[model samples]
Target chain A: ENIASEISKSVEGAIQQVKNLLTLAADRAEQIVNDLASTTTSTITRPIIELSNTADKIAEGNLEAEVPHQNRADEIGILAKSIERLRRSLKVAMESLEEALK
Target chain B: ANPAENIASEISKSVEGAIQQVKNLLTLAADRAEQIVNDLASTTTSTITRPIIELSNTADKIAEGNLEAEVPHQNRADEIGILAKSIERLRRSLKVAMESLEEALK
Candidate 1:
């Protein structure tokens, strides 16, 4: 019986430790998600706005469109960089369009 | 004593219960993490938005010559904490640039 008591105590202590670690893992997972969302929001807004403005310029018949920022790390930066690359393609297309009109 | 034997049996039963509880907790934690990761994956686009906004705000502050103002640090104990530190570094760089501009004006 005494031996059974010691084994019981040891098992109970191990159980407690496992519970605590599991709780900590859940809390950390939640924290990481919140952090990722907040970081994304603050980082992607301006580049998106810049790209929208470049689109407006193209809509107004401005063929010489350029995206101002060269840093293309964030989601908006990727979009802006893609638009800038397309702007060069558009320039060639516009010259052809102008020649066809003439 | 015979009573001591009964007490030991009870204790053993309690330990079995506790071990079951730990198993439950592990399952709960794993389920919660899966849900959270799914939610985060859906909102992954917003994650990139944050640093861009901070960078723009920092640029605005520099352009306005308000280099003395400090950027806020929300928390630094998690992933967001690291981001806050990076933004603080960017703010300090803005301050240095502002001071250089002031010196140029003189």
Candidate 2:
């Protein structure tokens, strides 16, 4: 009878530890999700605002002005790369339009 | 026949392996979270900026008197696409204004 009770207690302890580990994992995943969502919103909003400001400048006849270089080496980095590409291409297009007008 | 010692020894080994596995899985979850955060940040930034920049370019072209410069449709097929189409129509109206200004100049 004592041996059977001991085995039952050991199994119960192991099951409780496993449950605790799972709870910890769930908390960690939730925290990571929140962080990613917040960072994503910030990263996207800033570039969209920057592009709008740049467009305003271009409309004001600052065709030669270039978008500022961004050195972010994450998702923001790719956004900067795309913006720079558009800036160069638009510069060419604007120059062509100006030459044609003249 | 004494079985208590043998049972205790087996239970010890089993708990040790279970603990180790939990540690390994926790480490993996942490590493995966780090990578996912990095990728999520970058993806959203590029995705939003690309279309906005394109719309801005089309606007600039219209301001420069390119009435024939049709706005290129960037069908990323999102809210950005709606923005692109709206900006295209805006550029068309702006081009008309530029043409009227030229007529007045003549």
Candidate 3:
């Protein structure tokens, strides 16, 4: 009886350890999901929003509107910087045509 | 005496079973995490780096007087797609301006 009681006590301890490990794994997974969500929202969505507003300004003949988020090393940054290039291209083309006409 | 021995045997077996089950679960969890990490790395590289390089090259072509330079990956449902369309608009505007200059000179 004593030995049986001792084995049961050890088993209980083992179960507790396993439960703790499971809890830790769950917590880690949750954290990964949250981090990715927040990062995606900020880096991706925010830049796109800025680009949209810039596009609106360009459409209104406001070529002086500057593109935002150019320094980022991601796809959004590439696009933002490209838009700035587009602005310059439009500006140069318009100027050349005006000079030729004059 | 027999009853006590049987109880001890049962307890030992139960503990062994519990440990085995926990071990399997832990192994599975580890595998899941590894797979997620691999997927995340692959996606990050493909989506960001590849498209950026492609667009940058296109921009370079445009700079070199290739106004007809093609914008790529337009079907992408991301900011890159929007950029491609924007570049296309710039290409069209430049083409129009060039055409006007030619007409004026003629």
Candidate 4:
């Protein structure tokens, strides 16, 4: 009998609520620490962090930083839509100001 | 030198390794989130707050019949810009009203 199964019992617990940058909502954070194993995968974490960086860019008033992962489904998609809205709102506002100033 | 003892230690370390990996992942995600929050807070303070306060002051000046104060934040592309434009328009309208009244009195 292999002692591996007999002597090993793995246990890990972690749950985190990410920036939700604007404190917008509970589900708005793209990065979900739901399962640590899944979260550790580059497939899962990469897009989330990438979009998060995009949000940081937008939050700094960079309107051109492209927000990714909108095509995906789930919480991350919602997060992407929210950031896009932030970006587009700024763009429209800037355009309106430009025309109004004329 | 006991074989079973080393085997048990090896199995224990594997479980602990998995636990540590999970902890690392959680911390990494937490750090990403923390950075975003910090950046957004910085934006709110640096770009949005003072201009908002300036608009408030400009509005107060307008209420006090001192429409000469500058309407700040026109360069922004957010609500702040709209507010600055609105305040400027109010100043223009009040100035016109005063001028029209003076002409009527003359």
Candidate 3 steric clashes: 0
Candidate 1 — which residues are off by over 4 angstroms? A1-30, A57-65, A68-78, A89-102, B1-6, B42-106
| TM-score, B chain alone, candidates in order | 0.38, 0.73, 0.71, 0.69
User: What would the per-residue lDDT of candidate 1 be over residues B1-101, giving only the tens digit for each residue?
Assistant: 34566765776676677668767977886787679667766565455446445544543453355545454433635343343444344345444544544
Best by DockQ: 3
Q: Pick by TM-score: which candidate is best? A: 3
DockQ of 1: 0.06
TM-score, one value per model: 0.39, 0.55, 0.69, 0.45
State the displacement of the C-alpha of residue B106, model 4, in Å, after optimal TM-score superposition. 5.2
Ten-residue stretch with the least lDDT total in model 1 chain A: A81-90
TM-score of chain A of each: 0.49, 0.53, 0.72, 0.51
List, residue by residue over A1-102, the lDDT tens digit for candidate 4.
564453332221122223333255435564454543474455434654565456445545466755677786754465456446545644554454455452
Q: lDDT value for candidate 1?
A: 0.54
DockQ of each: 0.06, 0.09, 0.32, 0.03
Report the lDDT tens digits of candidate 4 across residue range B41-80. 5865676456645655665565455647676776767545
Roughly what TM-score does model 4 have, to 2 decimal places?
0.45
| lDDT (10s digit) by residue, model 3, range A1-102 | 696586557667766886797788789788988899799778666666567566545534467656777888766677677667766676666677778864
* Candidate 3 chain B, poorest ten consecutive residues by summed lDDT: B1-10
- The residue pairs that clash in candidate 3, if any, are none
lDDT for each residue of candidate 3 in B1-106, tens digit (9 for 90 to 100): 4456675576557667756876897788788778987888789779766776687678657755778888787787877677566566656666676677778778
